[PDB]
């Protein structure tokens, strides 16, 4: 089975270059081109280029020329000589280059052309920002009173993504909505986690949101009670 495995997500400062690797295995690496494509938030897919592993011949999207370089390395293992790695280096990054980058390969059937990509790497997220790593502040969204009430935690001003949020250490899951984070104009992210519960319980049950931001090594337990 064909397998394309990329290097992990990274945070890059504007002006940086990023080098992404794509380890390809389960077929003869020299026999198929690898393409790179990026999925950009609110803009969709953009083809970056292809490389043909035999000679390492390449073709770059006209609009990216000067900023992209593709190379490859062929296995040097005598009993496992047919896999290889494709590399794509993307330079002069700006926030507009914040995207998920994929390496892809065509299908191997008779009517498979070059562009229908049957095989995809798991993607590599690249975030381009000048923001400094920072753990979140956590504030309460307090329930204001049979009926049902809502409460939550406001997780503010952290970088980079992600933060994880549980309630009562995972014991509370029914009715939890943890929203997609938003990027604020400060360059820092923010999100809320909310949960609906019986008004009846507000005096009997304790509600604690557990916030974890690994990039800053920040863990917070925030107890939320009626205002």
């Amino acid at each position: 089975q064909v397998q394309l495995v990329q290097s992990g997500a990274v945070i890059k400062t504007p002006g940086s270059s990023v080098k992404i690797s794509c380890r390809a295995s389960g077929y003869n690496f020299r026999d198929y081109s690898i393409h790179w494509v990026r999925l950009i938030p609110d803009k969709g897919f953009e083809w970056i280029g292809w490389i043909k592993p035999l000679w390492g011949a390449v073709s770059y999207a006209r609009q990216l020329q000067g900023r992209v370089s593709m190379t490859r390395q062929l296995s040097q293992d005598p009993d496992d000589p047919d896999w290889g790695v494709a590399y794509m280096e993307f330079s002069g990054l700006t926030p507009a280059d914040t995207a998920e980058y994929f390496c892809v390969r065509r299908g191997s059937c008779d009517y498979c052309g070059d562009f229908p990509w049957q095989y995809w790497c798991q993607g590599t997220v690249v975030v381009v920002s000048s923001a400094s790593t920072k753990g979140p502040s956590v504030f309460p969204l307090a329930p204001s009173s049979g009926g049902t009430a809502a409460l939550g935690c406001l997780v503010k001003d952290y970088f980079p993504e992600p933060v994880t949020v549980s309630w009562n250490s995972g014991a509370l899951t029914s009715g939890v909505h943890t929203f997609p984070a938003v990027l604020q104009s400060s360059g820092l992210y923010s999100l809320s986690s909310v949960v609906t519960v019986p008004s009846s319980s507000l005096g009997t049950q304790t509600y604690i949101c557990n916030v974890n931001h690994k990039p800053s090594n920040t863990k917070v337990d925030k107890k939320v009670e009626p205002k």
């Binding site: 999925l39 969709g44 897919f45 953009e46 083809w47 999207a61 994929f102 299908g107 009517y111 498979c112 052309g113 562009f115 229908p116 990509w117 049957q118 995809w120 790497c121 798991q122 993607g123 502040s137 504030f139 309460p140 969204l141 307090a142 204001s144 049902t148 009430a149 809502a150 939550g152 406001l154 503010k156 909505h177 929203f179 997609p180 984070a181 938003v182 604020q184 923010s190 999100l191 809320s192 909310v194 609906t196 205002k227």
Partner: protein
């Protein structure tokens, strides 16, 4: 270059029904490719050469078309088929069509949350309005402070469509400096939604 225009932007249907999605190319005569991208998952090839199914793609996916007009038909929709679908020709791509789950209209439950004293102590005020468990996703949230409409100072976020009850939730967050917050009394979010016979308002008076 080739420009691919997909429609509709959003298609709302129920499990068991058949979806038809369209892709119009700016140039005729080329074959069409389709991909499926389920939320948060790697894109998956569905159709190539206009009508050929890719590896492991079930026969309820049917690609067709000719000239500039191309179609993806999904028969007897399965829960997993609700995803975004993209068309491609060579290095060119459509912007995608979202297939979403149709269900009965549901009005949102609306809640408003004043900023905490702790956050205020730090110079900023976040006011949050929650619209919980509604359908369809389209809703208008308006912030009013002492009856003045607020614009440019709030951000919205919307959940993914719930996998089990097909509803959405939405939060709107108004951000003000502490000084600005403390100059006004009435903070209100007005919600307009198909499920509501008239707009619903939740509010509070600062410090009350």
């Amino acid at each position: 270059e080739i420009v691919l225009t997909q429609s509709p932007g959003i298609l709302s249907l129920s499990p068991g029904e058949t979806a038809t999605l369209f892709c119009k190319a700016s140039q005729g005569g080329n074959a069409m490719t389709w991909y499926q991208k389920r939320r948060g998952q790697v894109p998956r090839l569905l159709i190539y050469d206009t009508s050929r199914r890719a590896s492991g793609v079930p026969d309820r996916f049917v690609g067709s078309g000719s000239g500039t007009d191309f179609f993806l038909t999904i028969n007897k929709l399965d829960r997993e088929d609700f995803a975004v679908y993209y068309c491609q020709q060579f290095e060119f791509f459509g912007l995608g069509s979202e297939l979403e789950v149709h269900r009965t209209v549901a009005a949102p439950s609306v809640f408003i949350f004043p900023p905490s004293d702790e956050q205020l102590k730090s110079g900023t005020a976040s006011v949050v309005c929650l619209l919980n468990n509604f359908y369809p996703r389209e809703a208008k949230v308006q912030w009013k402070v002492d009856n003045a409409l607020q614009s440019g100072n709030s951000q919205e976020s919307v959940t993914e469509q719930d996998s089990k009850d097909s509803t959405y939730s939405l939060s709107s967050t108004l951000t003000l400096s502490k000084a600005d917050y403390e100059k006004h009394k009435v903070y209100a979010c007005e919600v307009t939604h198909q499920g509501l016979s008239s707009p619903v308002t939740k509010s509070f008076n600062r410090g009350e």
